[PDB]
Ligand code: NA
């Protein structure tokens with residue numbers, strides 16, 4: 001049987017504040033830490049990525065749950081998905097407000113309904129039906145997010161894991177893009193676009209311009225290139241160069257193949273990431289390693 | 294310049310009488326004739342797929358626009374998408390309500406917004422700004438579907454090649470009978486509902502929505518075409534894999550950039566048609582080409 005791994009990442013932000021580099025890396029490393037503490041315990045590939053994105057949703061620095069950006073009405077609208085690479089089970093939600101963890105709501109769609117995708121008003125009904133609390137949105141909205149929005153009229157988070165049984169998964173959540181149209185939906189909740197997980201290949205999650213990612217099927221494509229024997233890195237660079245030259249898009253990828261191989265590559269300015277593997281945290285090409293206490 | 298081709302299909306409903314069948318037959322002819330017509334004025338594949346689709350929507354015998362099946366709460370909530378092979382531009386809607394023509398709203402999302410995908414309330418506000426007529430919730434409701442919901446409680450598409458080498462797909466549905474509210478199928482998940490890329494081809498899928506999502510069929514079929522399977526063999530394997538991995542039946546239509554087109558299926562039925570060379574094609578097996586009337 002195999003050694004687990006978790007990779008996580010978020011959408012790159014271009015140039016940022018020193019204490020923000022600092023707080024983002026801390027939020028990344030906590031997400032990895034949380035994910036691998038589920039794997040080190042015998043948790044599944046799914047529980048690891050569910051737990052790891054919940055971390056990123058709950059942390060106000062990240063555009064996902066609390067910290068999600070405001071739409072063109074100044075309201076939080078949120079998408080997410082998660083997928084079981086064993087059998088292709090998956091769950092997704094689009095256009096949701098007033099809940100803390102859509103990644104958690106996306107898990108219940110997969111497991112508790114004979115469906116993969118709920119949206120908007122309908123997603124709230126299952127939310128309420130499932131004892132998912134209701135919050136005032138003002139606790140997702142930051143003042144910073146109010147600010148950014150005003151100035152507009154003048155990224156995502158994700159996780160992949162391979163668990164002790166060789167099972168893989170991905171999870172992804174986002175508040176989208178500042179000033180998006182009411183009910184705009186991007187890559188996250190669309191399987192193969194934002195993510196895809198498969199025990200015959202591997203697991204990808206993606207960040208960057210949602211429209212560019214969905215038009216190219218950026219995660220499934222990534223998994224297509226490994227399906228013809230490219231290495232996880234040759235694949236990743238092949239798919240991101242295609243989104244760049246074909247639809248002018250940029251972004252990042254984290255992949256772990258069915259053998260434990262992995263990489264973090266982005267065609268954008270930067271991309272926040274950390275990974276966890278063989279008791280070591282990998283951070284980041286300034287990738288640097290430490291022990292997992 | 295290319296001999297233009299348009300193909301239409303609807304999902305099967307298993308064996309049906311003749312009284313239903315000829316209706317279903319006429320419908321495939323009309324939408325395929327609308328689409329052929331448009332390509333005869335040398336119009337675009339994006340134009341043609343749209344029109345074929347609009348026609349099935351208006352035809353109450355098909356499960357899209359007027360005469361969509363019902364969700365669990367007694368009502369119609371519709372899904373649609375459109376894609377252009379030229380530069381992969383897309384537009385899609387999901388769980389849109391009380392309008393006649395979901396597919397046109399998809400193309401409006403394509404052409405007049407920065408995004409590619411809007412849902413529920415944002416799709417509704419958007420369409421209202423386009424002056425899409427909000428139409429009565431019960432003109433969209435037919436009485437045969439009332440029974441289908443009442444019994445139970447106790448997709449269509451087109452692909453096209455124009456005379457300038459472009460490909461395109463569109464699709465439309467009311468979903469699955471008795472679906473949870475807000476349930477989003479494959480029809481608006483680019484890569485699953487359909488795919489169009491001028492460099493490879495265009496595809497449309499009917500069948501079990503969630504499975505089609507899971508195996509990402511539309512893009513799946515095209516992977517093989519790229520790798521060099523014929524269109525017939527691409528459907529056999531794309532659809533092969535859907536049956537083996539997720540145990541879902543369905544079927545597809547597909548057109549190559551080389552103008553070779555096929556319709557193939559694993560379900561019991563897939564009423565389809567194709568119009569190329571001043572001819573109509575159809576067949577449960579024994580294919581029947583009649584000159585175009
Ligand atoms: Na957050």
Ligand code: NA
Pocket residue numbers: 349350351352353354355356357358359360361
């Ligand atoms: Na109809």
